[PDB]
Ligand binder design. Structure first.
Ligand SMILES: *[C@@H]1O[C@H](CO)[C@@H](O)[C@H](O)[C@H]1NC(C)=O
Ligand SMILES: *[C@@H]1O[C@H](CO)[C@@H](O)[C@H](O)[C@H]1NC(C)=O
Lengths: 50, 49
């Protein structure tokens, strides 16, 4: 992404800051959340096996 | 070849934010005079009328 000289932050979705400009080095880096995901357990009956 | 304001879309990019902190109500535009105020020519001394 290219930030205009006045631009500092990035919000394409308007409720999360996807990208930002580092204050020391003028490179622009984008923030991806640390990820997530549902966890499902597939089990037969405990009357049969655990 | 467009005398008036052209038809189209151009987004204006910011230039600078001056912390002047003053009160502004009126403004005026400064021009450049190529001709002479002491001796005004009959014509063409200025820029194509
Ligand atoms: C800010 O300092 C950093 C680290 O010293 C360096 O990348 C750069 O010289 C400076 N950048 C700016 C914004 O002046
Ligand atoms: C600016 O000046 C006008 C008078 O020309 C006055 O009425 C107005 O209150 C002033 N505004 C500020 C913010 O000083």
């Amino acid at each position: 992404k290219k930030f205009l000289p006045f631009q500092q932050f990035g919000r394409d979705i308007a409720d999360t800051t996807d990208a930002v400009r580092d204050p020391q080095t003028l490179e622009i880096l984008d923030i991806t959340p640390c990820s997530f995901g549902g966890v499902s357990v597939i089990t037969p009956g405990t009357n049969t096996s655990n | 070849l467009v005398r008036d304001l052209p038809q189209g879309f151009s987004a204006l990019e910011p230039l600078v934010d001056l912390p002047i902190g003053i009160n502004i109500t009126r403004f005026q535009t400064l021009l450049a005079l190529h001709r002479s105020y002491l001796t005004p020519g009959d014509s063409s001394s200025g820029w194509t009328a």
